[PDB]
Design a protein around this ligand. Structure first.
Ligand code: ZN
Length: 106
């Protein structure tokens, strides 16, 4: 399905806005999911070599990004936005409902 860059950009702003400790909190796996589609949506296909074995954080991010090689920016937009909507719906607070509404109106 069609997803606009504008809705992606709003989703990114929201994701970046979330505190590490809060009622709306992506899991570790969900943050990797956001990461991989964020890179794929903006940079496109992974364009660097895998970090060294002892760069635990860096190599986990790289692996995620590499795993979506070949995905179009538009699918990346869609997957990113949809993951945030999933998370907001699961959080199910008046705050999360407001975020859903902002994405819808973007
Ligand atoms: Zn489209």
């Amino acid at each position: 399905s069609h997803m606009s860059k504008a809705k992606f950009d709003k989703a990114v702003e929201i994701v970046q806005s979330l505190p590490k400790d809060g009622p709306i909190k992506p899991t570790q796996d969900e943050q990797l999911y956001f990461y991989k589609y964020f890179k794929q949506a903006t940079v496109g296909d992974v364009n660097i070599s895998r970090p060294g074995l002892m760069d635990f954080t860096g190599k986990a991010k790289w692996d995620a990004w590499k795993s979506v090689e070949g995905t179009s920016k538009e699918v990346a937009y869609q997957k990113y936005v949809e993951k945030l909507l999933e998370i907001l719906k699961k959080a199910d607070t008046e705050e999360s409902k407001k975020y859903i509404a902002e994405i819808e109106a973007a």
